[PDB]
């Protein structure tokens, strides 16, 4: 079909919304460039936009106490046994799903293809998407044989426009990492325009609104916009482990995490790790106004993160690692009764823009903002919030920067995982060898397919009592 467009109605609307400015390149551009921008403007809603913006502006603190012992858990193979067990019992029954947050958090990755496809340089030459899928295959097998019939954890993948196409094509040509594509469900959140300090949407060039996804907290309208909580209701999925696409060490569908959050009776739970240093970029979990939720370190006043506890630990040592537990009942609650209440958070950015004659200049002081909704906002509404302190070195190593120079980089994503599996091999009966025998970047390269092991387990059969010369690669 052709290409119909009422531009009188457009200017009208835009004059009302006060955004006439978005049309000043219009008679400086060609018909294809012109059809694009229309559909895009037409897409938006400027009264709800001017609304979230207001909501944003209106979003500007001694009521904080740390988290107690009460809502915080932390190796006693008498209860870890339970959690690992009771968790596992849920997987086997199919009341566990995952949910991948692969939408476009941060930019400083190879600005082309989605984060989850990034090749950290593993000996397996594997991308993060892979490691995630194989982890789910491994968490399945472990619960199926521990219980005696096959099972599944479906894989809701939340994407945006910026990532959907590529990732779906990566899954495609990769034969869905051997996962029955019935149980991997890509979907899509909305995008929000960047706006100036005045409220005016920005053109990132002659024909394009400066778009970017609306926060991973935009999960909730995605589930609302895609009947997802029904699809979970229609499989029996009662618990969903939400997680961020960038963690190379994620315990996808962590039985200890589920089992824990259940014995706790909590409707909604989260993983945390000791904040490394006071300025570390991790939101902290603690009660403001007596109610436990998360504040991102950037909203945390600086000189408070240095307060220490009576033993000398950080008073606000509990950084959230974007790894949460949600009962499908709590999801319904917030989609059908709380998303209105989620603040869109202002992030003051340098939005490359297109001037008044068109230079496409970028920065010269931050010039606009990106409103986002954060997934952990929904904690404020929790009815019984749980939280698990988890070992950083075992399950939190984010890929944020593209530069191996920097921390949180392929180099550190790499080394973290390679180091981890090295320790599994140690604890599992295996000693390593130099170029001249002996024993003791880690001393020895070793990577272990999640297929073969998920937390370090089931390795004795392969490794115990045997010596190996670097590297040792384990897959089937």
Collapsing DSSP to helix, strand or coil, 123 comes out as coil
CB 54 within 8 A of CB 63: no
What is the residue-wise DSSP string for 405-462?
A: TSSSSHHHHHHHHHHHHHHHHHHTT-EEEBTTB-----SS-EEE-TTT-SSS-S-HHH
Angle at 154 between CA 233 and CA 191, to 5 degrees: 85
PDB experimental method: X-ray
102 labelled as ligand-binding? Answer: yes
Domain at 413-474: CATH code = 2.10.10
164 labelled as ligand-binding? Answer: no
Q: What are the residues whose beta carbons fall under 8 Å from the beta carbon of 156, sequence distance 6 or more?
A: 97, 98, 99, 100, 185, 187, 228, 232, 240
d(CA 253, CA 324): 10
Tokens of 359: 């230079």
Residue 53: which of 455, 247, 344, 464 has the closest Cα? Answer: 344
What is the residue-wise DSSP string for 335-366?
A: HTTTGGGPPPEEEEE------SS------SS-
Find residue 42's DSSP bridge partners: none
Residue 344: which of 137, 76, 52 has the closest Cα? Answer: 52
CB 195 within 8 A of CB 44: no
469 labelled as ligand-binding? Answer: no
The secondary element (H helix, E strand) that includes residue 8 is helix 7-17
Helix residue ranges per DSSP H, 216-287: 219-224, 228-233, 255-263
Find residue 348's DSSP bridge partners: 369
Residue 360: which of 246, 202, 245, 476 has the closest Cα? Answer: 202
Ramachandran area for residue 252 (φ above 0: left; ψ -120 to 50: alpha; else beta): beta
Range(s) within the chain of domains with CATH label 2.10.10: 413-474
Find residue 271's DSSP bridge partners: 388
- Surface-to-core class of residue 26, CB atoms within 10 Å of its CB (0-12 exposed, 13-18 middle, 19+ buried): middle
Q: Residue holding tokens 């014995």?
A: 263
101 labelled as ligand-binding? Answer: yes
218 labelled as ligand-binding? Answer: no
370 labelled as ligand-binding? Answer: yes
365 labelled as ligand-binding? Answer: no
128 phi/psi in degrees, rounded to 5? -70, -40
Find residue 243's DSSP bridge partners: 100, 323
Domain at 64-400: CATH code = 3.90.550.10
Q: Residue holding tokens 């709800």?
A: 48
Range(s) within the chain of domains with CATH label 3.90.550.10: 64-400
């Amino acid at each position: 079909g052709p290409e119909l467009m009422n531009i009188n109605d457009l200017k009208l609307t835009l004059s009302k919304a006060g955004q006439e400015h978005l049309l000043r390149f219009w008679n400086e551009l060609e018909e294809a460039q012109q059809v694009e921008l229309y559909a895009e403007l037409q897409a938006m809603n400027f009264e709800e936009l001017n609304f979230f913006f207001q909501k944003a502006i209106e979003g500007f603190a001694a009521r904080l106490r740390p988290l107690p012992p009460e809502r915080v858990g932390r190796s006693d193979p008498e209860t870890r046994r339970r959690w690992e067990e009771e968790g596992f019992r849920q997987i086997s029954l199919n009341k566990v799903a995952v949910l991948l947050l692969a939408g476009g958090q941060g930019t400083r990755l190879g600005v082309t293809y989605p984060k989850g496809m990034y090749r950290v340089g593993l000996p397996s030459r594997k991308t993060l998407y892979q490691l995630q899928a194989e982890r789910i295959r491994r968490v399945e097998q472990l619960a199926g044989e521990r219980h005696g019939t096959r099972c599944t954890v479906p894989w809701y993948v939340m994407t945006s426009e910026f990532t959907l196409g590529p990732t779906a094509e990566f899954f495609r040509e990769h034969n869905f990492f051997h996962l029955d594509p019935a149980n991997v469900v890509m979907f899509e959140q909305r995008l929000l325009p960047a706006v100036t300090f005045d409220g005016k949407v920005i053109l990132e060039r002659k024909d394009k609104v400066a778009m970017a996804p609306d926060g991973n907290g935009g999960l909730y309208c995605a589930l609302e916009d895609h009947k997802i909580l029904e699809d979970m209701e229609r499989r029996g999925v009662e618990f969903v482990h939400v997680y961020c696409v960038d963690n190379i060490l994620v315990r996808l569908a962590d039985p200890v995490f589920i089992g824990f959050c259940v014995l706790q009776g909590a409707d909604c739970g989260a993983k945390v790790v000791e904040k490394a240093y006071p300025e570390e970029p991790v939101g902290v979990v603690c009660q403001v106004d007596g109610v436990p939720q998360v504040v991102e370190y950037s909203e945390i006043s600086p000189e408070t993160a240095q307060l220490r506890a009576s033993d000398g630990s950080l008073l606000y040592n509990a950084g959230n690692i974007c790894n949460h537990f949600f009962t499908r009942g709590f999801l319904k609650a917030v989609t059908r009764e709380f998303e209105p209440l989620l603040k869109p958070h202002v992030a003051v950015k340098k939005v490359p823009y297109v001037d008044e004659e068109g230079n496409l200049v970028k920065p010269l002081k931050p010039n606009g903002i990106k409103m986002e909704k954060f997934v952990f906002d929904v904690f404020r509404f929790a009815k019984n919030f749980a939280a698990l302190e988890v070992l950083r070195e075992e399950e939190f190593s984010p890929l944020k920067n593209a530069e191996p120079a920097d921390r949180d980089s392929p180099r550190t994503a790499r080394q973290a995982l390679l180091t981890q599996h090295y320790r599994w091999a140690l604890r599992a009966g295996a000693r390593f060898l130099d170029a001249h025998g002996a024993w003791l970047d880690p001393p020895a390269i070793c990577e272990i397919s999640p297929l073969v092991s998920y937390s370090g387990e089931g390795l004795e059969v392969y490794l115990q009592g045997r010596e190996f010369q670097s590297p040792l690669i384990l897959d089937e």
